[PDB]
């Protein structure tokens, strides 16, 4: 974003390639945003992955077991897309993943907004990989 974050939001709050909107524009409207670096994929300015300098992504890696990528945008390198995101491939267990995410998101005051949400997505991604490894042992309905 050469232009500021608020302006990018006012530019893309109504249409962009990563926005999946269904059920019309009535009270039934359902809105998600499917860019890689949006955590809840909720299309709001808090979570928007395009209108922000400081964004974090938590994704399962390519085909390989139990490797999670945590990426944070580099604020200063921002007009350089090839060197725009600091990606971090970590493969340790969950408690040491959570400490490192807190290190990279909340503890350095990078963006404490998304302290809890980034960790929640980390839990979801981790257990997704865990069940891709083991299988459906639990119906997860109680």
């Amino acid at each position: 974003t050469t232009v500021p974050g608020s302006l990018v939001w006012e530019l893309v709050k109504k249409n962009n390639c990563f926005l999946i909107k269904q059920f019309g524009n009535s009270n039934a409207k359902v809105q998600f945003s499917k860019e890689p670096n949006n955590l809840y994929n909720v299309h709001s300015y808090k979570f928007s992955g395009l209108a922000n300098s400081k964004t974090v992504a938590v994704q399962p890696s390519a085909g390989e077991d139990k490797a999670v990528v945590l990426s944070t945008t580099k604020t200063k390198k921002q007009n350089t897309p090839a060197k725009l995101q600091h990606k971090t491939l970590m493969r340790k267990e969950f408690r040491k993943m959570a400490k490192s995410v807190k290190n990279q998101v909340c503890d350095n005051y990078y963006r404490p907004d998304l302290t809890k949400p980034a960790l929640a997505r980390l839990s979801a991604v981790y257990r997704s990989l865990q069940v891709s490894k083991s299988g459906i042992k639990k119906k997860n309905r109680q």
């Binding site: 608020s6 302006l7 006012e10 530019l11």
Partner: protein
């Protein structure tokens, strides 16, 4: 059953957000929403309510009137929520600090070459958020050519309203109702 007019719901209307979907104007709107909410300055209230205006409620104000309004008040920052047009009828303009939406590219050059500083409303919100030492202004609203047509009808006594005429001349609405010698004098 209760004896109310339209169930009590307010029947007047006002703007609550500009019809204009200009993103910069929406950002000023957000800023001044914050300011009027957290600051409680009546000046911010008026500025907000005047960003919620149409371009016929935001007429241009030229320097020949702005300088009148700045004659002896150079300490206070002029604010006009509208447009500043130049006016080739004035010669010496005091170095003045004016905040506005737009500056006609010749009027902004006039002000800069006169040595004043030419602001936008965000720069105004920097060094006068509550509006310290500011001079709010409005351009002439009823000066618009269309307004010369409004009011009581052209053909009733004492009305000086311009009637819609497709062209001026002797043949275009001068005959009967505009003089004694053909009918009556309006």
């Amino acid at each position: 059953g209760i004896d109310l007019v339209a169930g009590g719901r307010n029947k007047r209307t006002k703007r609550t957000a500009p019809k204009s979907d200009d993103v910069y104007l929406k950002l000023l709107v957000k800023l001044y929403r914050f300011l009027v909410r957290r600051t409680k300055s009546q000046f911010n209230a008026v500025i907000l309510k005047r960003l919620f205006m149409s371009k016929t409620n935001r007429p241009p104000l030229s320097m020949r009137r702005l300088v009148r309004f700045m004659e002896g008040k150079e300490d206070k920052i002029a604010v006009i929520v509208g447009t500043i047009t130049d006016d080739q009828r004035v010669y010496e303009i005091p170095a003045m600090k004016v905040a506005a939406l737009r500056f006609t590219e010749t009027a902004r050059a006039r002000i800069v070459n006169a040595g004043g500083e030419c602001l936008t409303f965000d720069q105004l919100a920097l060094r006068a958020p509550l509006g310290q030492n500011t001079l709010l202004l409005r351009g002439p609203k009823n000066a618009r050519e269309a307004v010369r047509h409004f009011g009581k009808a052209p053909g009733v006594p004492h009305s000086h309203t311009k009637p819609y005429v497709r062209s001026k001349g002797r043949k275009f609405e001068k005959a009967r109702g505009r003089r004694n010698s053909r009918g009556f004098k309006v």
